Amino acid sequence: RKYFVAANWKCNGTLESIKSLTNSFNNLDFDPSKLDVVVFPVSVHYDHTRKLLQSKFSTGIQNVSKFGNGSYTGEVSAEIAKDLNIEYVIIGHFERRKYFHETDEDVREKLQASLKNNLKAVVCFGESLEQREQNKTIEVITKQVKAFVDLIDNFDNVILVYEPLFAIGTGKTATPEQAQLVHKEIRKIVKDTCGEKQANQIRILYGGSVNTENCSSLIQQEDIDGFLVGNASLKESFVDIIKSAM
Template identity: 50%
Template sequence: MPILKESDETIAQKVAYALEKGLKVMPCIGELLEEREAGKTNEVNERQLKAIAGAVTDWTNVVIAYEPVWAIGTGKVATPEQAQEVHAHLRSWISENVSAEVAQSVRILYGGSVSPKNCEELSKQPDVDGFLVGGASLKPDFITVIKSYETSL
């Protein structure tokens, strides 16, 4: 459960309200380390995405960010293959439960400890549409992340 103890339903309500007010939204979904280790990554992310999808009628202003909680500020990172696996699963879920058109058009960003060391390989993954960068964006070598992504386009 998130630090603020917000339920999936509360997040979905916030997403719906923001969209109703004309804002663009980027809900972050992701699993805890113990959920990953228990093999529940897809189950947790599907549950979170299902709540959001139930609140969204128009996906034009929605960007999904997969941010594994276990990678936030810990220095632990998902391998490019792990990130791709989750992103592909999310896109498949969206295709099956929302529409193939939305699955193709919605951007799914990766937000788990993106750095100059891993951004090049992450940007090569077909279902990783970009990055949600936190602390690394405050460092001078962040330009490496930007350039790596640009060359992958």
Template identity: 45%
Template sequence: MAVVSTSLASQLSGPKSATSHCPQFSGLRRSCSKLDHSLSLSSTQSLIQNVDSHLRLSSSRRGCRGVVTMAGTGKFFVGGNWKCNGTKDSISKLISDLNSAKLEADVDVVVAPPFVYIDQVKNSLSDRIEIAAQNSWIGKGGAFTGEISVEQLKDIGCKWVVLGHSERRHVIGEDDEFIGKKAGYALSQNLGVIACIGELLKEREEGKTFDVCFQQMKAFADAVPSWDNVVIAYEPVWAIGTGKVATPQQAQEVHIAVREWLKKNVSAEVASKTRIIYGGSVNGSNCAELAKQEDIDGFLVGGASLKGPEFATIVNSVTSKKVAA
């Protein structure tokens, strides 16, 4: 999917100033009023490279990519995380709905069932939709009661695994380093990783959104052997399962900041090609507006992924994306 960005310089010189967006981004920037509208491109880049909780990016400063093909596939990415939900009967109905749904062709679609139903889903779901696991162990299997190995996941047909989800971080207690090691091992065994990052409400209110996301990104970057099979999912924890959704501008602001972090700390190529998707109470009503944002390359969907027709609507929101040939 080719995406045409507006240059950073032209955005800064445009009619919408960084300061004018302050009310929409409460908690992300404490001192946006100090931004100088006459900043040069070089000084702006310097600011981006030194982002901290006292100076935050504005979503009006878009455009690090130019014309790119996302992740080498040219495709939007939509994942459905079923979490700890479903029975054999309800999942059979969901599979039937998904199999009969008309899905846009230029979207990678993945669902993550509970472990005990992966085989059922794999054997009855259309090949159009790939299977992900919701977790994996840090290394090769063995005497690790209750864990699932990457090798086992691949053996039953999984192509992806969701790692770093907020519920694993904040309910189960997994830390950044542990999650990074899981990701590194999964990728070393050619299992794709949906790498989740995101801040708590308290962290957003304290202006630490970028600090938290960058710290979580660093843990992934320190461990992964390659970014070729990684999709980053930005999921503000305060928006997961709460019905609260980041505004399209709020989501875009974090997505562009994460892309800039990749550019500085990994490479410009990885920053350009890595898909960054949004999660957090995404549904059939809000997906189109979110999809229009330049750096939102898809979605990781929770509750709405349990409803076949609504999940199809979210997949098909790719049509809202501004695309240039």
């Protein structure tokens, strides 16, 4: 199972900060055939970032439309992404489910659209704090994963990301042990619905808060195949996070 480390720059960056950042990133010597390292800049920053990053680095966009080409002002369709040779796309990130009312139905349609166009997809899901305290974690995640999991035809092209919302900006922290449990269950769902071969083939990333300090203990976990890094990916120290997966 090939490790997957992704940098979700989210809504951050300037042409200068990116030029400076990608420069550091490029100094890290790693074998792309042994590790997947993806960077997701802001859509308008894609071209700039892509030119600046060396081939060993994959690039994608933080969101894609559930509709195809057509009258949908402000959207980016998978057809357009394909035409642009954009490799990955993030779908269902909690920030979009939260602020932009994206639903599991949306996540499903977006995934289907992405795959139909040969885009690799990093699909996110997770439970809120309320959901965790009510002890509905497994339940919620099962409903979320089962909302799209039956569309995955190739388990190398779809990467799942567990976002423990209950730990993001709530004063709480997710421990490697806790993530390991959830990951194991997420993988179990995939097995029971797609098969063991698939379940062992698909990468499941930790989408919680990752930093130079906790990355090693997290990646160590059996069912944690890497992570979707937030703010830490906006600093040069991100390479040390990539290193912990080499």
